[PDB]
Amino acid sequence: GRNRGRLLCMLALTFMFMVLEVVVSRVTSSLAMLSDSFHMLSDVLALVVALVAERFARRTHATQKNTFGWIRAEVMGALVNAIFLTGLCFAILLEAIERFIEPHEMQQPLVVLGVGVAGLLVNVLGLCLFHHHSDRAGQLNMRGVFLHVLGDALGSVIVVVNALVFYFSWKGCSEGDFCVNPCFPDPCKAYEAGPCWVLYLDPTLCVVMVCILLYTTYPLLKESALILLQTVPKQIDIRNLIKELRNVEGVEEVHELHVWQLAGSRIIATAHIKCEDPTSYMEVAKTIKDVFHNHGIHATTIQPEFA
Amino acid sequence: GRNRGRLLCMLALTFMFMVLEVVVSRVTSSLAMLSDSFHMLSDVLALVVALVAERFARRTHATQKNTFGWIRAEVMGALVNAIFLTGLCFAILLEAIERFIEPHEMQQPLVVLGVGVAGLLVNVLGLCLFHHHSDRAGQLNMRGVFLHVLGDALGSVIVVVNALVFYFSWKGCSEGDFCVNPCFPDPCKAYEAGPCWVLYLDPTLCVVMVCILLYTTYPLLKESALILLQTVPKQIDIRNLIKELRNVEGVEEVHELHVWQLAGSRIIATAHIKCEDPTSYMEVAKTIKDVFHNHGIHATTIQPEFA
Ligand SMILES: [Zn+2]
Ligand SMILES: [Zn+2]
């Protein structure tokens, strides 16, 4: 309820800011604003994926197609959100390089600064909505959206700072009379412009930005992508389980121990444990289940192989 | 061995064509060629992800970190490849729109056509290498690479066709004397050009292209993303398993059956099956294992709950 409400609220603000970008571009007759609107549509797609994962995760319930439920679906949502962000971060890095090799002037700096401030306010509102997620499957699913919100919030901050630096320290050649543009090599033409450091302010910061994101993206793409690989949860180690099951009387060996994490705090472990006396099997198995519960594994399947 | 050889060969050709693009851009002094080279670097990243998945999938061995192995890692590689491709298809769609709202002229059509033909030859070689995959994971990891190769091969075909149509049917205004450019609205300026249909040839085809890719991408993103959700394999249905286990004498009920697919043809099913007589448990369990093998489930775990 609360999570879906937050996601729907952020989606609604994202459409509203999309409409704001479109109408502002229409009055100003600018196309890069439309491109930024379509990037906001990419953000809409990320929010939609998060919403799909969050609904479907409620199924739980033993269905015919999935006997476990659909909480792992939420986990997958987190995972896919993380991979879309690694990808958009890599696209930002490739755009930054493309702007290093060819700088781009910013036209109409004031409206760009205003739209950047509006987007910063929207992204800060979204960040406050998603602050609680810096049980777990919910934490991962909300962390994906939180990382997307942090990414486009940092983008808004970069845009605002760049627009301010352009408006305060860039002397353009758009006047049209006796102006030479050293930094931007060919001003499309068949005084001296502003210092060349400003024209590269957008790329460098962007690069720094993606690094930040990549850093903060790495745990999620680590945490979500190891649950679906059925890696043993970090709280659980296999040596202690093996030795404690071997120390239990009535246990000859523990031939095949499989431990994995379904989603969040639901850890599933199945083992085969050899026993000699069928009569003692029930108390041996209850002790084994007690050990599994002691170490935090609550759903188990134990097959006794009488010899 | 063979799969890693194919992946390394395609990676080597991809670096060689990257170097070709870079050197051609250097002699021609063109920047969009560098952008295409960085897109080829994105293809390099996809191939690298595939290589990592393939290399890690050969571990198995029931590592301490993962008691099942790392074949699911290969599955995840397939999945992430699919996701990456969907994202690039959506970026192509957003670039196509950006070119619909603002068409772009193609400069130096002959060198673009030649580089497109070279890339088409490289991509056809890669497609022939990956033709065999239109175990199962081996297929999924390669189908991911096959879809990437098909995508940039279709991109090369689009580039070649567009360059040919420009060279044959576009009358540019680059001569500099008495030329008006109706289609491209402002030719950056403070006769009649070629017909306006050519300037939009690249977007429309691109859109069609992504549709194709998206279509062919959907099964992979369906097939890989349902294995990691532990959905029951399509060959297996739960009603027959339940009824056949109930019909077995000595079985009171099958209380929990979870059946899922690890990777490829390795299907794992665990169940609880209440039995009355411990003496009859061994033959009852061997019959149950025989049924599980009969339906194609070879790794099981069956816990008898004596009452
Ligand atoms: Zn066994
Ligand atoms: Zn039970």
The tokens for B295 are 């339906």
Torsions phi, psi of B272, nearest 5?
-115, 135
Gaps in chain A (C to N over 2.5 angstroms) fall after 134, 190
Same-fold call for B2-227 versus B238-304? no
Q: Of the candidates B295, B173, B299, B280, which has an alpha carbon nearest to the alpha carbon of residue B239?
A: B295
Distance CA A51, CA A74 (A): 9
Distance CA A7, CA A11 (A): 6
A11 CA: distance to closest CA in chain B (Å): 19
Sort out which chain A residues have CB atoms less than 8 A from B231's CB and list them.
65-66
Q: Is the dihedral of CA A162, A167, A171, A174 positive or negative?
A: positive
A249: DSSP letter: T
Q: How far, rounded to the nearest angstrom, does the alpha carbon of residue A73 sit from its chain's CA centroid?
A: 15
Q: Does A22 touch chain B (CB under 8 A)?
A: no
The tokens for A98 are 């493309």
Distance CA A270, CA A257 (A): 6
Classify residue B116 as exposed, middle or buried by CB count within 10 Å of its CB (0-12, 13-18, 19+).
Answer: buried
Q: Taking a C-beta distance cutoff of 8 angstroms, is the pair A285, A304 a contact? A: yes
Burial A217-254 (b: 16+ CB within 10 A, else e): beebbebbbbbbbbbbeeebebeebeebbeebebbeeb
Report in angstroms the alpha-carbon separations of B90 from A38, A42, A87, A269, A270: 11, 9, 12, 40, 42
Q: Taking a C-beta distance cutoff of 8 angstroms, is the pair B284, B275 a contact? A: yes
- Helix (H/G/I), strand (E/B), else coil: A273: strand
Instruction: For residue A284, report the distance from its CA to the centre of ligand 2, in Å.
Output: 15
First to last CA, chain B: 53
Q: Taking a C-beta distance cutoff of 8 angstroms, is the pair A102, A186 a contact? A: no
Instruction: For residue B287, report the distance from its CA to the centre of ligand 2, in Å.
Output: 20
- Helix (H/G/I), strand (E/B), else coil: A272: strand
A176: DSSP letter: -
Using CA coordinates, name the residue in chain A closest to B282.
A306
First to last CA, chain A: 53
Instruction: For residue B197, report the distance from its CA to the centre of ligand 2, in Å.
Output: 69
Catalogue the long-range contacts made by A14-21 (C-beta closer than 8 Å, 24 or more residues apart). A14/A40, A14/A43, A14/A44, A14/A47, A14/A122, A15/A44, A16/A122, A17/A118, A17/A119, A17/A122, A18/A44, A20/A115, A20/A118, A21/A115
Q: Taking a C-beta distance cutoff of 8 angstroms, is the pair A271, A302 a contact? A: yes
Q: Of the candidates B99, B96, B94, B84, which has an alpha carbon nearest to the alpha carbon of residue B42?
A: B84
Using CA coordinates, name the residue in chain B closest to A66.
B231
A281 CA: distance to closest CA in chain B (Å): 9
Q: Taking a C-beta distance cutoff of 8 angstroms, is the pair A40, A122 a contact? A: no
Element (H, E) at B269: strand B266-273
Q: Of the candidates A12, A133, A14, A148, which has an alpha carbon nearest to the alpha carbon of residue A80?
A: A148
Burial B264-277 (b: 16+ CB within 10 A, else e): bebbbbbbbbebee
Which of B230, B260, B270 has its CB closest to that of A301? B270
Which of B66, B87, B102 has its CB closest to that of A31? B102
Total Cβ atoms within 10 A of residue B249: 8
- Interchain proximity A76–B302, CB inside 8 Å: no
Q: Which residues contact B144 (CB under 8 A, 6 or more apart)?
A: B46, B50, B77, B78, B81, B82, B85, B220
Tell me the DSSP string of A44-57: HHHHHHHHHHHHHT
Instruction: For residue A298, report the distance from its CA to the centre of ligand 2, in Å.
Output: 11
What residues does each domain of chain B span? 2-227, 238-304
Distance CA B95, CA A38 (A): 10
State the alpha helices, DSSP H only, in chain A.
2-28, 32-56, 71-101, 109-129, 136-169, 196-199, 201-227, 238-247, 278-294
Q: Does B95 touch chain A (CB under 8 A)?
A: no
Q: Taking a C-beta distance cutoff of 8 angstroms, is the pair A301, B270 a contact? A: yes
Q: Of the candidates A231, A267, A255, which has an alpha carbon nearest to the alpha carbon of residue A307?
A: A255
Q: Of the candidates B124, B110, B194, which has an alpha carbon nearest to the alpha carbon of residue B159?
A: B110
Q: Taking a C-beta distance cutoff of 8 angstroms, is the pair B183, B193 a contact? A: yes
Q: Does A146 touch chain B (CB under 8 A)?
A: no
Q: Does B60 touch chain A (CB under 8 A)?
A: no
Side-by-side strand order, sheet with B266-273: B254-263, B266-273, B299-304
Q: How long a stretch of residues is chain B? A: 307
- Please give the annotated binding residues of A for Zn(2+), written as ranges: 39, 43, 148, 152
- Amino acid A208 reads V
A216: left (phi over 0), alpha (psi -120 to 50) or beta: alpha
- Interchain proximity B302–A301, CB inside 8 Å: yes
Distance CA B303, CA B240 (A): 20
Resolution in A: 3.3
Distance CA A233, CA A223 (A): 10
Hey, what CATH topology would domain A2-227 get?
Answer: Alpha-lytic protease prodomain-like (1.20.1510)
- Helix (H/G/I), strand (E/B), else coil: A274: strand
- Helix (H/G/I), strand (E/B), else coil: B272: strand
Q: Does A259 touch chain B (CB under 8 A)?
A: yes
* Beta strand B299-304 pairing with B266-273: parallel
Distance CA A85, CA A221 (A): 10
Q: Does A64 touch chain B (CB under 8 A)?
A: yes
Distance CA B240, CA B296 (A): 13
Distance CA A21, CA B44 (A): 35
| Residue entry with tokens 């306010």 | A121
Q: Angle, to 10 degrees, between the axis of helix A201-227 and the axis of helix A71-101?
A: 160
Instruction: For residue B3, report the distance from its CA to the centre of ligand 2, in Å.
Output: 43
Hey, what CATH topology would domain B238-304 get?
Answer: Alpha-Beta Plaits (3.30.70)
Name the residues around ion ligand 2, CB cutoff 5 A. B 272
Q: Does B190 touch chain A (CB under 8 A)?
A: yes
Instruction: For residue B282, report the distance from its CA to the centre of ligand 2, in Å.
Output: 18
On whether the A238-306 domain is CATH 2.20.25.90, my answer is no
Q: Which residues contact B205 (CB under 8 A, 6 or more apart)?
A: B158, B161, B162
Q: Taking a C-beta distance cutoff of 8 angstroms, is the pair B21, B33 a contact? A: yes
Q: Does A230 touch chain B (CB under 8 A)?
A: yes
A298: DSSP letter: -
